[PDB]
Amino acid sequence: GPVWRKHYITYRINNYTPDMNREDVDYAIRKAFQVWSNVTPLKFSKINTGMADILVVFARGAHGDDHAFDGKGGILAHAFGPGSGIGGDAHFDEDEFWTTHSGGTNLFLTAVHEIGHSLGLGHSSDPKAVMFPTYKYVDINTFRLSADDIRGIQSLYG
Numbered sequence: 001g002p003v004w005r006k007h008y009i010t011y012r013i014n015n016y017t018p019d020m021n022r023e024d025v026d027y028a029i030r031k032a033f034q035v036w037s038n039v040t041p042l043k044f045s046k047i048n049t050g051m052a053d054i055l056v057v058f059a060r061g062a063h064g065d066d067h068a069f070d071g072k073g074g075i076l077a078h079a080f081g082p083g084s085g086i087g088g089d090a091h092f093d094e095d096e097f098w099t100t101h102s103g104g105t106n107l108f109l110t111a112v113h114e115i116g117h118s119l120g121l122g123h124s125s126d127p128k129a130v131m132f133p134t135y136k137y138v139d140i141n142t143f144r145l146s147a148d149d150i151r152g153i154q155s156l157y158g
């Protein structure tokens with residue numbers, strides 16, 4: 001599938017969930033990108049204006065991309081594979097309650113998974129992979145990609 005054909009990738013936080021402190025949104029997203037820069041040649045930079053490669057959006061219900069969100073539960077987030085325009089973008093359902101911890105839905109863990117899609121990864125059948133289709137909290141301070149995730153991302157980059 002499509003992959004970014006450049007090493008410097010930009011993101012922008014379009015808007016911020018009221019569920020969290022701003023600095024904690026910034027940090028969770030930054031750390032999630034770092035999970036992937038750690039195992040690829042990719043470098044990620046947050047920009048504050050202009051067109052980023054990866055636009056990060058919190059939105060609810062129908063939000064302009066034909067993939068409406070569904071209220072609390074169910075779909076938590078989705079992201080588009082590499083490409084121009086909407087490609088790469090990562091959208092988080094505002095009807096979830098995003099957090100820095102095990103309460104609500106953990107934004108960092110969700111973003112690691114979504115960014116994997118923004119980089120071109122699909123889903124893994126391994127429950128230990130971050131790219132497994134199902135959300136489950138794991139301690140975020142000791143989080144590590146599975147061997148399956150590493151094999152997937154290194155099949156695309158590096």
Ligand SMILES: COc1ccc(-c2ccc(S(=O)(=O)c3ccccc3CC(=O)O)cc2)cc1
Nearest residue numbers: 074075076077078109110113130132133134135
């Ligand atoms: C700890 O690793 C994680 C594993 C999975 C996810 C995760 C993120 C999103 C979703 S989801 O929005 O409910 C979803 C459910 C079914 C199909 C597609 C999605 C979106 C998606 O997988 O990106 C489901 C799971 C998030 C983190």
Ligand SMILES: [Ca+2]
Nearest residue numbers: 071073075093
């Ligand atoms: Ca939802």
Ligand SMILES: [Ca+2]
Nearest residue numbers: 053085086087
């Ligand atoms: Ca984009």
Ligand SMILES: [Ca+2]
Nearest residue numbers: 019094096097
């Ligand atoms: Ca919310």
Ligand SMILES: [Zn+2]
Nearest residue numbers: 063065067091
């Ligand atoms: Zn969307």
Ligand SMILES: [Zn+2]
Nearest residue numbers: 113117123133
């Ligand atoms: Zn997914």
